[PDB]
Amino acid sequence: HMQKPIVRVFLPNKQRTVVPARCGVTVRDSLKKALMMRGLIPECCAVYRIQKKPIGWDTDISWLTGEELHVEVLENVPLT
Amino acid sequence: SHMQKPIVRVFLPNKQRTVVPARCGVTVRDSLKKALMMRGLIPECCAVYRIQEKKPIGWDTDISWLTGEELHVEVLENVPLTTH
């Protein structure tokens, strides 16, 4: 809304959160706490918008005000 | 087939494709670096998925775990970074 710009975020395991769509704040930093609370970290997850479209973790979240993001855990395959 | 020559099939943006060697110890990023560059892409501007149906994998994944699989590379949504 005009007063309170937010982004709705759907999380693993049927969970969800709302974060403020603050200018200059990455998606990564916007969601760090919500992820931590659930034992997740951005580096082990992918984020996407709707309208199944992947977005970078370093995106400025204010560009996505009004949108829904989805966070999925990355496939469990060993790193090099 | 793969016994002698383990490979991963990779689908790329704009209906393109490539095959890469699935060699132990090599990242997805590095396996695909050259194919992406030929198309003016960079892994950091893209996402990669395995077919299982599209499940996101990390760029630093060891590609040898994916022998026989099909990967898909998509360009990230065009949304400014905070540094822009």
Curated annotation (Swiss-Prot), chain A:
Brain and testis. Protein kinase involved in the transduction of mitogenic signals from the cell membrane to the nucleus. Phosphorylates MAP2K1, and thereby activates the MAP kinase signal transduction pathway. Phosphorylates PFKFB2. May play a role in the postsynaptic responses of hippocampal neurons. It is found in: Nucleus; Cytoplasm; Cell membrane. The gene is BRAF. Monomer. Homodimer. Heterodimerizes with RAF1, and the heterodimer possesses a highly increased kinase activity compared to the respective homodimers or monomers. Heterodimerization is mitogen-regulated and enhanced by 14-3-3 proteins. Heterodimerizes (via N-terminus) with KSR1 (via N-terminus) or KSR2 (via N-terminus) in a MAP2K1-dependent manner. Interacts with MAP2K1 and MAP2K2. Found in a complex with at least BRAF, HRAS, MAP2K1, MAPK3 and RGS14. Residues 5-74 form the RBD domain. This is Serine/threonine-protein kinase B-raf. It is linked to Defects in BRAF are found in a wide range of cancers. Belongs to the protein kinase superfamily. TKL Ser/Thr protein kinase family. RAF subfamily. Ubiquitinated by RNF149; which leads to proteasomal degradation.
